Design a binder for this molecule. Sequence first.
Ligand SMILES: [Ca+2]
Ligand SMILES: [Ca+2]
Ligand SMILES: [Ca+2]
Ligand SMILES: [Ca+2]
Ligand SMILES: [Ca+2]
Ligand SMILES: [Ca+2]
Ligand SMILES: [Ca+2]
Ligand SMILES: [K+]
Length: 35
Amino acid sequence: KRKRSRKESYSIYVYKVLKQVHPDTGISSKAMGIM
DNA sequence: CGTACGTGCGTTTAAGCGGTGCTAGAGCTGTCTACGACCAATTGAGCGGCCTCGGCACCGGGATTGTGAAAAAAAAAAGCTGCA
Ligand SMILES: [Ca+2]
Ligand SMILES: [Ca+2]
Ligand SMILES: [Ca+2]
Ligand SMILES: [Ca+2]
Ligand SMILES: [Ca+2]
Ligand SMILES: [Ca+2]
Ligand SMILES: [Ca+2]
Ligand SMILES: [K+]
């Protein structure tokens, strides 16, 4: 096992900016996909 | 059914032409060095996997607020005059 490739994405940085501008609001996986 | 737009005319304008004179700056060359690629070593930021726990989808009951449809009233219009 331990495949799923390792696919890079901006989602940690998106979350990081989100917590700056709106610290109590989160984000669905589709919405993250669009970001 | 009313007039905005196409046609044609006379009047006016300035584009185009060709020419001249001047130079800003496009673009090329040579020099030199600050910067970015390249490399190996190192390791923590970010990856996948995994579990949890509350957001959010779904439910039922009733009040309330849009959202419109019909029915009822009000009005404007149509036809009819009876005098002066
Ligand atoms: Ca005229
Ligand atoms: Ca120059
Ligand atoms: Ca870590
Ligand atoms: Ca994850
Ligand atoms: Ca309901
Ligand atoms: Ca309404
Ligand atoms: Ca309505
Ligand atoms: K340089």
